[PDB]
Symmetry: none
């Protein structure tokens, strides 16, 4: 027998801000 | 016998902000 | 015998903001 | 018999700030 | 028998500030 | 008199791989 | 007098791969 | 029998400041 | 008189690998 | 029989300041 | 009279490997 | 029978100051 | 009269390996 | 039987100042 | 009259290995 | 039987000053 | 008249090994 | 039966001043 | 008139080994 | 007039071994 | 006129061994 149990509660892995992958700027 | 149990609660993996993949700008 | 159980609650994977794939500006 | 149990509570692994992957600036 | 138990409480592994992967600046 | 000049060559700011914003996994 | 020049060449800001905004899964 | 138990409390492994991977500055 | 000049050559600020913003794993 | 037990309390292993991996400065 | 000149050559500020912003692992 | 118990209290192993891995200065 | 000149050559400020911002491991 | 017990109290192993790995200076 | 000249050659400030910002391990 | 007990109190092994690994100066 | 000239060569300030900002370990 | 007990009170093993590993200087 | 010239050769200020900022160990 | 010239040759200020800022250990 | 000239040879100020800033140990 094999068992695996996972529990994520209220607000796991959520974004409430800024996620920028890539950013290029000049002057 | 093999078992796997996963539970995600209220606001799991949700976005409440900004997600930008790629951004380019001169000035 | 093999088992998998997954539970999504209220707002799993929901977007309540902004998702941008790609953005090119200029001046 | 094999068991693995994991629990993530309220606000685990969330982002409330800024995540930037890559940044390039001319000036 | 084999067991492994892990518990993450309220605000584990969260970002509230700034994460910058890479930064290149001319001036 | 004010002047600003920017030049982006061939494959500048391009993606040739994988960009993932957010990732959540049970097992 | 105010001037701004921006030049994009062949494949500026192009996607030649994969972009994923948000990804969730169980097992 | 084999057991391993781990507990992480409220603000364990969180970032509230600045994390910079790499920085290059001309001036 | 004010001037600012920037030049990006062939393959500036490009991604040819993996950029992951956030990753959560149960096991 | 084998047992390991670990406990992290309130604010273990957190960053509230500045972490810079690498820094190069011309002037 | 004010001048600022910047030049980025071939593979400047590019990613060929792996960039991970945040990582949480149960086991 | 084998046992190992570890307890980290309120504010263990936290950074409240500055951590710089490497620093190079021209002037 | 004020001047500032910067030159980045072939492969400046690039990532060919692994950049991890934050890592938390239960076992 | 074999036992090992360790206790790290309030503010053990923290940094509240400056940690510099390597520093090179021209002038 | 004021001048400042900086030259970075082939492979300055690159990462070819591993950069880890923060790491916490239970066992 | 074998027993080993260690207790670190309030502010053991902390840095409140400056730790420099290596310093090189031209003047 | 004021001048400051800096040169960096092939493998300046490059990481070919391992940089770890912070490491916490139980058993 | 084998026993060893160690106790470290106060700010035992803390740094409040300046630690420099190596120092090289010109004129 | 004022002048300052600095030259960093081939492999100056590079890391080929291990840089660890902080290390805490239970056993 | 004022002049200051500095030359660092092949392999100045490089790490090929181990730099550990702070180490804390139980048994 | 004021002149100062510094030449550091092939392998000045490098580390090929173990630098440990601070070390604390139980039994």
């Amino acid at each position: 027998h094999h068992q695996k149990l996972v529990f994520f509660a209220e607000d796991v892995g959520s974004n409430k801000g800024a996620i920028i992958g890539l950013m290029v700027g000049g002057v």
